[PDB]
């Protein structure tokens, strides 16, 4: 017998298969019946309704007929990622019950996209720094989901680690890299099924870590100075490992006792660094006599464990 007029609520559509890759294809299959649940043949539809990002590039065959009630088109999927949105369509009204909604999923990493990227090219041995990864596809989509690991190469690498990683979505992943007390030449691939996610490796500088004042030490060229005449200081700086630290001006050192109690303070001039974390700077001794403590100061911290002790001479 003859089918009564299509009903939208008593028909439907399936994309087939769902996760279709970006420029592959999706076969949509509309099965449309009347109020009875007839199957509904011989109509004139008009092309599939395409929406969502993965619409853009997407092109719809015609509809085919099967005979049975139900209808079938295949997509041609462009290159953006994201979800796609089918609905049947007749003279623009809506011919199924819902739209068939599916994710077209990004294609295979692209080490090439993709790009890797530390928050600070410089880190302080023992100190940590984020690593960013932007995974992507061949035509720029972002890659969801992924399983990742890291590989680290280079000098300071011996050591150092890398933490478990977190997604922020929209294919970005961020973890944590810890340097160990070896400094030098660093570098961070991260790793997709153990094989390289970004075009080049993230290159950083492991420094000298945070001064250690017990590792430190200052002495002077004269433990007997007289008053307002000088003596050189020589201030050697290390971290916790015994890495020289270098770059890193010290402030004035704080001076206690007797002899900083005079008229004339005694007076440190500039720190020039002559060696491998070796600061020098010339003393001028005060107008009083006695005792004098030296504190030298780096990043307003004491930079040794106990005072430079002076006996300044009248």
Same mark, same amino acid.
Not at 31 to 38: E, M, Q, R, V
Not at 123 to 143: C, F, M, R, Y
Not at 181 to 190: A, F, H, N, Q
């Given at each position: 017998?003859?089918?009564?007029?299509?009903?939208?609520?008593?028909?439907?559509?399936?994309?087939?298969?769902?996760?279709?890759?970006?420029?592959?294809?999706?076969?949509?299959?509309?099965?449309?019946?009347?109020?009875?649940? +007839?199957?509904?043949?011989?109509? +004139?539809?008009?092309?599939?309704?395409?929406?969502?990002?993965?619409?853009?590039?997407?092109?719809?065959?015609?509809?085919?007929?099967?005979?049975?009630?139900?209808?079938?088109?295949?997509?041609?999927?462009?290159?953006?990622?994201?979800?796609?949105?089918? #609905?049947?369509?007749?003279?623009? @009204?809506?011919?199924?019950?819902?739209?068939?909604?599916? %994710?077209?999923?990004?294609?295979?990493?692209?080490?090439? @996209?993709?790009?890797?990227?530390?928050?600070? /090219?410089?880190?302080?041995?023992?100190?940590?720094?984020?690593?960013?990864?932007?995974?992507?596809?061949?035509?720029?989509?972002?890659?969801?989901?992924?399983?990742?690991?890291?590989?680290?190469?280079?000098?300071?690498?011996?050591?150092?680690?890398?933490?478990?990683?977190?997604?922020?979505?929209?294919?970005?992943?961020?973890?944590?890299?810890?340097?160990?007390?070896? %400094?030098?030449?660093?570098?961070? #691939?991260?790793?997709?099924?153990?094989?390289?996610?970004?075009?080049?490796?993230?290159?950083?500088?492991?420094?000298?870590?945070? #001064?250690?004042?017990?590792?430190?030490?200052?002495?002077?060229?004269?433990?007997?100075?007289?008053?307002? %005449?000088?003596?050189?200081?020589?201030?050697? #700086?290390?971290?916790?490992?015994?890495?020289?630290?270098?770059?890193?001006?010290? /402030?004035?050192?704080?001076?206690?006792?007797?002899?900083?109690?005079?008229?004339?303070?005694?007076?440190?001039?500039?720190?020039?660094?002559?060696?491998?974390?070796?600061?020098?700077?010339? &003393? %001028? !001794?005060?107008?009083?006599?006695?005792? !004098?403590?030296?504190?030298?100061?780096?990043?307003? @911290?004491?930079?040794?464990? @106990?005072? &430079?002790? !002076?006996?300044?001479?009248?």
């Amino acid at each position: 017998f003859v089918a009564g007029p299509l009903d939208a609520a008593h028909s439907s559509i399936t994309l087939n298969p769902d996760k279709p890759v970006v420029g592959g294809t999706v076969t949509a299959i509309w099965t449309a019946k009347d109020a009875n649940d +007839n199957p509904v043949t011989g109509l +004139n539809p008009d092309a599939p309704s395409l929406s969502g990002a993965a619409a853009a590039g997407s092109t719809a065959s015609g509809w085919t007929d099967n005979g049975d009630g139900t209808w079938t088109a295949q997509i041609s999927l462009g290159t953006t990622a994201g979800e796609l949105d089918v #609905m049947p369509k007749l003279n623009g @009204q809506d011919a199924a019950a819902n739209a068939a909604k599916v %994710t077209v999923v990004a294609d295979a990493l692209s080490s090439n @996209q993709s790009k890797v990227s530390v928050a600070e /090219d410089h880190v302080k041995a023992g100190e940590s720094t984020t690593v960013t990864l932007v995974a992507k596809d061949a035509h720029g989509n972002a890659i969801s989901g992924l399983s990742l690991s890291a590989s680290l190469t280079g000098t300071a690498s011996e050591g150092a680690t890398v933490s478990s990683w977190t997604e922020k979505g929209d294919g970005s992943y961020v973890a944590t890299l810890t340097t160990g007390g070896k %400094t030098g030449e660093l570098r961070v #691939m991260p790793l997709f099924n153990g094989q390289p996610a970004a075009t080049e490796a993230a290159q950083l500088t492991v420094i000298a870590g945070e #001064m250690s004042s017990a590792n430190s030490t200052l002495v002077a060229d004269n433990k007997t100075p007289t008053v307002k %005449t000088t003596t050189e200081l020589t201030f050697t #700086m290390k971290d916790a490992y015994g890495n020289p630290v270098t770059g890193l001006k010290p /402030d004035a050192p704080v001076f206690s006792g007797a002899a900083s109690t005079g008229s004339e303070r005694p007076s440190a001039g500039n720190w020039t660094e002559k060696g491998n974390g070796v600061y020098v700077s010339t &003393l %001028t !001794l005060g107008s009083a006599a006695g005792q !004098l403590s030296v504190m030298p100061r780096v990043n307003g @911290q004491n930079a040794v464990a @106990q005072p &430079l002790v !002076l006996n300044v001479a009248g």
